[PDB]
Write an enzyme that holds these catalytic residues in place. Structure first.
Site, mmCIF file in Angstrom:
data_model
loop_
_atom_site.group_PDB
_atom_site.id
_atom_site.type_symbol
_atom_site.label_atom_id
_atom_site.label_comp_id
_atom_site.label_asym_id
_atom_site.label_seq_id
_atom_site.Cartn_x
_atom_site.Cartn_y
_atom_site.Cartn_z
ATOM 1 N N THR G 1 -12.643 -20.779 -23.208
ATOM 2 C CA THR G 1 -12.902 -21.334 -21.883
ATOM 3 C C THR G 1 -14.403 -21.410 -21.635
ATOM 4 O O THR G 1 -15.127 -20.459 -21.913
ATOM 5 C CB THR G 1 -12.257 -20.484 -20.772
HETATM 6 C C1 7C7 Z 1 2.881 -20.895 -21.408
HETATM 7 C C2 7C7 Z 1 1.613 -21.768 -21.266
HETATM 8 N N1 7C7 Z 1 0.443 -21.052 -20.714
HETATM 9 C C3 7C7 Z 1 0.261 -21.144 -19.238
HETATM 10 C C4 7C7 Z 1 -0.682 -22.287 -18.834
HETATM 11 C C5 7C7 Z 1 -0.460 -20.322 -21.501
HETATM 12 O O1 7C7 Z 1 -0.262 -20.275 -22.714
HETATM 13 C C6 7C7 Z 1 -1.642 -19.590 -20.943
HETATM 14 C C7 7C7 Z 1 -2.053 -18.196 -21.553
HETATM 15 N N2 7C7 Z 1 -1.281 -17.052 -21.155
HETATM 16 C C8 7C7 Z 1 -1.420 -15.772 -21.687
HETATM 17 O O2 7C7 Z 1 -2.244 -15.597 -22.574
HETATM 18 C C9 7C7 Z 1 -0.552 -14.635 -21.178
HETATM 19 C C10 7C7 Z 1 -1.239 -13.285 -20.950
HETATM 20 C C11 7C7 Z 1 -0.270 -12.192 -20.645
HETATM 21 C C12 7C7 Z 1 0.298 -11.370 -21.626
HETATM 22 C C13 7C7 Z 1 1.200 -10.360 -21.299
HETATM 23 C C14 7C7 Z 1 1.560 -10.151 -19.976
HETATM 24 C C15 7C7 Z 1 1.009 -10.958 -18.993
HETATM 25 C C16 7C7 Z 1 0.111 -11.962 -19.328
HETATM 26 C C17 7C7 Z 1 -3.523 -17.939 -21.088
HETATM 27 O O3 7C7 Z 1 -3.720 -17.468 -19.971
HETATM 28 N N3 7C7 Z 1 -4.602 -18.211 -21.891
HETATM 29 C C18 7C7 Z 1 -5.989 -18.004 -21.513
HETATM 30 C C19 7C7 Z 1 -6.764 -17.235 -22.619
HETATM 31 O O4 7C7 Z 1 -7.523 -16.236 -21.977
HETATM 32 C C20 7C7 Z 1 -8.914 -16.447 -22.086
HETATM 33 C C21 7C7 Z 1 -6.629 -19.374 -21.218
HETATM 34 O O5 7C7 Z 1 -6.453 -20.298 -22.003
HETATM 35 N N4 7C7 Z 1 -7.377 -19.579 -20.070
HETATM 36 C C22 7C7 Z 1 -8.002 -20.840 -19.693
HETATM 37 C C23 7C7 Z 1 -7.615 -21.364 -18.328
HETATM 38 C C24 7C7 Z 1 -8.469 -21.201 -17.271
HETATM 39 C C25 7C7 Z 1 -8.149 -21.671 -15.985
HETATM 40 C C26 7C7 Z 1 -6.965 -22.305 -15.751
HETATM 41 C C27 7C7 Z 1 -6.046 -22.503 -16.807
HETATM 42 C C28 7C7 Z 1 -4.819 -23.167 -16.560
HETATM 43 C C29 7C7 Z 1 -3.920 -23.365 -17.563
HETATM 44 C C30 7C7 Z 1 -4.229 -22.899 -18.852
HETATM 45 C C31 7C7 Z 1 -5.408 -22.259 -19.098
HETATM 46 C C32 7C7 Z 1 -6.368 -22.031 -18.090
#
Ligand code: 7C7
Ligand code: 7C7
Ligand code: 7C7
Ligand code: 7C7
EC number: 3.4.25.1
Lengths: 216, 223, 222, 217, 222, 221, 223, 217
Positions: G1
């Site tokens: 990010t």
């Molecule tokens: C199913 C599809 N999805 C949801 C959109 C994802 O895979 C997102 C991913 N979840 C996770 O990594 C889950 C974390 C977790 C693990 C165990 C218990 C609870 C939580 C994520 O946040 N990844 C982060 C990595 O951290 C740095 C990320 O990419 N963050 C970037 C980001 C910033 C602002 C808005 C966003 C909106 C959508 C997607 C990403 C966004």
């Protein structure tokens, strides 16, 4: 507002006026409690603390509630600080606060009149203190005697003419029963705050001992 | 930290050092650890500064609070019991490191003998207390040096002046063997604080008097 | 610390040493561990000083509280249950280290046999209690030495005075083998405290008599 | 609404009118409290804080409740900040609030009248302050004297005619007992105390017994 | 990260550096750590920025709240006690890493001698406070260096100007020995912030003046 | 419940009418508060926030409760957002809500009348704002002056015929004391006035009191 | 990010990449991380997707809520304080792993100078904030690289368009050195999202403009 | 207020007057309870504790509430201290307190009259104790007998002339049913029980059916 308080004062006053009378007197040995009481086990006179005694007139369950509340207060304060910080003036003051609250806020005012008496601790020279707390929380500091319950005017007048300070136990007892009759052992409850007892000054005078005192 | 208290004929004296530390670092030189809590009692506290000052302040407020509410002060036994309750109340935080123990010195106006009306009460972290009938007591990290000094010097205590000198000298020995207890600073003119209590009440000893006694002790140790 | 209590014909005796410690350091020489808790009971407590004194003071207040509220004192069984309830109440803090165990001695005015009206009750940290039928009991860090001494000396108990001597001697043996128990200090004149209870109530034993018995024992062992 | 508040006001006012009278007046040494009081241990005059004193007329248990509440307020605020932040204005103000709430919301209004007095701290020059708080929470800042309880008009008029700023203790006591006597008085019928602006810390001292007898002759 | 305060005849001065860090990484160059909290008091705070700024804002609001409610400001003692109570309230979070210590500098309008009416109060994480009688004090990761520098330089404080100079030079020594404390940035033109308080109140020292003092110190060191 | 609200409204209205009068008027330097007040330390006029001031008529403990509540509201909102977000309109609105609830639900209604005033922030050019909140929560935005307590009609007329939006502080003060005198006869001295101003020329806190010899200098020449 | 924001004469610009990851795995290529939260503020958030999106949504609701309740929008300082308080509210969950940090870009309509009315505010996990006076800022796993790029490229910012290209190029360098930051995808036609804010409000930058800037950058890096 | 209370007294008194009668009298073997009761399973006489028994007249659900409360109290006290610390005086006292609170504070006062009786513990010599608690919390200590419910005066006088201290069980039962009749009764219209001082543990026992019949004869 004026109506409700008139009615509460009238109910309490009438209730106390219909109750049997109680006298507390200062004498040379401490404080003497003498109460008209036909019962065998229901008590109108009780110990509150080491040198503090309690006497009541009116409705039994009510002044017994107040009696228990006073013992609770005394024991709690003596534990929280010390036994000598507990005074008759404290208990009289709390009874004033409590009876004020009861008079104004409870479903029915308490038909009771209270006397808290305090004698000196063993080996001290202090004049006994008598406190009168009425049904509305009014509190009075009395030096010689307290009369409560029933028709109090004849008894008060009888003691006014017949009370001498530092009377002996027999004399004060006899003048007390005389004032009340204005009465044997199984119709009187008698107890004394005996300033000559080292710790607990309260002691009851019952049965043969009481009759030996009454026949003189 | 060292707080000493000793009985003398007709009264009691309490003195405390002026050093505040954080570990090895000296963070205060003029600190006050003995407080007049009552017309007839002084309290000196050792331990965490915040907890100690809160103890003295809250305690004084409590005593005067009872006195104004009931028109009469607490019996000395009552004062003891309230201080003990306060310490026991702090026990948990003391286990967490906010530990403070008080030493109580008072003059019982209700005592039979006006010459032995002095009282010295020590406390532990659980609020257990002991009224010392051997005449002296100390609290703090230098308390054992001060107590052992007073064991040898107590026979010289016959009035307020002799007891005050013995107290200051015990604080001197304490500071001599305990780096957390501060000795007399002759460069800055900072000396232990002392309270004396007799039938006329509790008064702060002027610092210049403590200074005079300190110089007497020092030259006594030099020659 | 050691508290002893033994039955004698017509009453009971309880005595305790005067030593207060913080670890190996002596922090007290004149402390009182035996308290008259009501006209017919005494309580001697071992353990943390704060908890012990709180036990004795609160307990006495509780007994007199019931007596003034209800016009009659508690039966001895009730007194036992109340003290037990208090100990079990302190169990949680006791696990944290503020442990105090009491030993109860009383004279039951309602007992059938006025010679066997003596009572000695021991307690554990959970409030469990035992009324001791073999006549003596002790509590504290020297209690095993005091009990084994009384096991040998109890045959000499024929009245109040012999029972008091056996009590003082048991405290002497306890102090002899347990450094937390204070023996007779002849330099300062500090001796164990004792309370005796018979049909006339509970009275403090005068210090002079205990001093005489102590000097007799010391002179007998020299 | 109109009825209820009329009746409450009349109950409280009648209750206060049937009670013993109290005078508090500023004099050269601070503030003087003198109250008609036959009792030996029941007090109408009290210390509140270092330089703040309390006087009351009416039903004892009620103004004693208010007295203890005031002591709690003062002690608590002095603990929360410092002793010096506690002022007679504060106690008078909180008493106004409290008596407002009691008058409008309690089962029976309090049959009390309160006076809060403040003298200067040691060594400082500040005119004494007297505050009168009535049963409904009304509050008045009065410059010379306050009269409470019983028939107040004769006493107020007597003082209005006989009061001089900065009288000595004996003169102020005389003017005070004289003003009290002009309505319906030796030692064992008076309660006397002073906020003595010359005391170093606690200014409240009582004048009782032999000393008071000597100041009355 | 380093806050200094020193008394001068007739007033007090407080100055603080401008550096914000996360570990070794520099996250701020223009940060303000000294806040005028009242007409006669300034507060400089070291530690977690969130906690420090919240302390300053909440404290100022608390003082003016009391002043508007009661019509008169708090005595300086009351101000001390309130700041201490706030710190003590944060002790639990401080044990978890949200630690902030304040340094209080004020002018007591109720003091007898107006020339020494300046006040400097230091605090620990438990709310314990000390009114500094030796004239100067510092807080933060460079406070030891600043305190010792002022120990050598304090004899030169005779007025507000010399006291402000010594303050800025103490911050200079702090930044010289503590990488968490920022020195004067002549390239960006960022200098410590300073507040001066006398009988006329508390005013922000203009940056230009601190700058000239900084250059005087710098070429004084070459 | 017709007569409950009738009696509450009449109790509060009479309570305010028996109280002493208060005037607040806009002048060239900001807002002027002048209140008939014999006390030296009991206040009817107070600061609420940086540029917002408060004046009240009626029962002291009640409008002092409201005053403390308003100070609380202002300080809390300024903490929750920013000092610049606290406005006189906000405080007047909260006073309307609060006095509405009190009037309908408290044991006895509050016998008070409130004025909330706001001047411009330093260096900004905007006209002062005055708000009147009455015992039942009614709220009014008034352009020149507010009169509260006692017999308001004579004072209102007195201000109405000789009002200057741009009078000096002394001139506006004289106009105000003249208006107060017309409501009760010939002398309103210092020892009977409480005066304060929202001074739009102060950098931050606009509220300042005019007391004693200074106020005398403003009443004579 | 990586989220970037920089001030230009007369406004502010904020842009963010489009990549969503779970460890090394790419779970999203088109995600939107920069949100217009009110007519004059945009918020870009880095960290846990759930927390970031809820921050943006709840924050916008809060601002418009105040505006409708009081008839006037919050001062910019108030907006900052509300966002900070929200972050601090999430501190505990952040300590458990639900960490999200926002970067705030705004135009203060009440500012004196309308050319420098742009505002850039950064936040830490405790709600501590800094208004960035040096003109640019970044947040996220590529924020160091983007910040160091903007340090060198910021002198080229003379209007909104040059500032926009500097923002996109900083995001490019971020994606070049940080695998968690997504670069321009020319095969799928996915490019960073950007918001620009001036006195006329906050508007989304059209994708065609960003794609042109991206292709220009790529060609410039190829030769 | 004063009207409400006398109205409550009138409701309770009328309710008790319209209720069947109960007698408890001391005899040589302890205490005897005899009650007018047609029911097969609804009881007006009950055990409270080892040596303490309970009898009631008036509205069933109400004195059954009071009965259950008394059992709760007695058992709780015996557990908190000891079984021998539970006395009939205690139960009578708590009943006085309880009926006071009920009389003044419940929506409708209890139309009940209570008797608490205690005999000596096994092997002890102490005269039985009888306590009468009326609807307003009035408490009375009676030495020989207690009559409750309905028109009591004929029953009291009948017992007065026919009561002998230390009568046998048959004599006391005879004189009791005679007195109640004076206010034709038999097994299927009476509820009878005794506190039998000769039981070692639980003194309360019922006399039913063929046994009762023998005694009646
Ligand atoms: C199913 C599809 N999805 C949801 C959109 C994802 O895979 C997102 C991913 N979840 C996770 O990594 C889950 C974390 C977790 C693990 C165990 C218990 C609870 C939580 C994520 O946040 N990844 C982060 C990595 O951290 C740095 C990320 O990419 N963050 C970037 C980001 C910033 C602002 C808005 C966003 C909106 C959508 C997607 C990403 C966004
Ligand atoms: C900033 C200036 N200052 C506050 C006054 C200090 O440096 C005091 C020092 N704090 C500390 O050591 C910090 C304690 C702490 C640690 C972790 C979380 C929270 C708190 C202290 O108490 N030291 C103790 C050492 O332990 C015994 C001490 O000196 N105690 C002696 C002492 C006794 C009575 C009253 C006192 C008043 C002021 C200073 C000291 C006092
Ligand atoms: C201030 C002087 N003083 C209080 C009197 C003491 O030094 C007593 C000592 N405190 C302690 O040892 C402190 C315990 C503690 C541990 C952790 C947190 C907090 C507290 C103690 O009880 N020691 C025990 C050790 O048991 C083996 C003890 O001596 N117990 C004997 C004892 C029994 C009955 C009544 C007593 C009354 C006073 C003193 C002692 C008494
Ligand atoms: C994102 C921008 N920003 C906020 C301004 C920062 O980077 C500051 C930095 N945050 C942090 O270090 C985050 C703390 C944290 C970590 C994990 C969970 C929760 C909290 C900091 O406080 N640093 C401390 C280092 O401690 C010694 C510091 O510099 N403190 C100095 C300081 C004092 C008074 C007011 C200040 C205002 C702004 C910045 C700094 C201030």
């Amino acid at each position: 507002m004026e109506q409700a308080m008139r009615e509460r004062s009238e109910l309490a006053r009438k209730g106390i006026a219909r109750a049997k009378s109680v006298v507390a007197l200062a004498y040379a040995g401490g404080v003497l409690f003498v109460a008209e009481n036909p019962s065998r086990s229901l008590q109108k006179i009780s110990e509150l603390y080491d040198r503090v005694g309690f006497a009541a007139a009116g409705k039994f369950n009510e002044f017994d509630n107040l009696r228990r509340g006073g013992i609770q207060f005394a024991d709690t304060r003596g534990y929280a600080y010390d036994r000598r910080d507990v005074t008759g003036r404290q208990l009289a003051n709390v009874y004033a606060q409590t009876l004020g609250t009861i008079f104004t806020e409870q479903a029915k005012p308490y038909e009771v009149e209270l006397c808290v008496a305090e004698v000196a601790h063993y080996g001290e020279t202090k004049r006994p203190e008598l406190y009168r707390i009425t049904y509305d929380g009014s509190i009075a500091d009395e030096p010689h005697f307290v009369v409560m319950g029933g028709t109090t005017e004849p008894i008060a007048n009888a003691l006014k003419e017949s009370y001498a300070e530092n009377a002996s136990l027999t004399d004060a007892l006899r003048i007390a029963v005389a004032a009340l009759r204005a009465l044997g052992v199984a119709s009187l409850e008698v107890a004394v705050l005996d300033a000559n007892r080292p710790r607990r000054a309260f002691r009851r005078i019952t049965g043969s001992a009481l009759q030996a005192l009454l026949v003189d | 930290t060292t707080i000493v208290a000793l009985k003398y004929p007709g009264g009691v004296v309490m003195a405390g050092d002026r050093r505040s530390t954080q570990g090895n670092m000296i963070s205060g030189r003029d600190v006050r650890k003995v407080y007049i809590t009552d017309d007839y009692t002084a309290t000196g506290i050792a331990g965490t500064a915040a907890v100690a000052v809160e103890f003295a302040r809250l305690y004084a407020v409590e005593l005067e609070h009872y006195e104004k509410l009931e028109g009469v002060p607490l019996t000395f036994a009552g004062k003891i019991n309230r201080l003990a309750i306060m310490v026991r109340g702090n026990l948990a935080a003391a286990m967490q490191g906010l530990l403070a123990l008080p030493l109580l010195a008072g003059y019982d106006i209700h005592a039979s003998d006006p010459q032995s009306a002095g009282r010295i009460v020590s406390f532990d972290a659980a609020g257990g207390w002991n009224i010392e009938e051997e005449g002296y007591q100390a609290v703090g990290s230098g308390s054992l040096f001060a107590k052992s000094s007073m064991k040898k010097l107590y026979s010289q205590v016959t009035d307020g002046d002799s007891g005050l000198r013995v107290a200051v000298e015990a604080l001197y020995d304490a500071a001599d063997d305990d780096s957390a207890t501060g000795g007399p600073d002759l460069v800055r003119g900072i000396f232990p604080t002392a309270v004396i209590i007799d039938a006329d009440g509790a008064v702060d000893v002027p610092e210049s008097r403590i200074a005079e006694l300190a110089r007497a002790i020092i030259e006594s140790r030099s020659g």
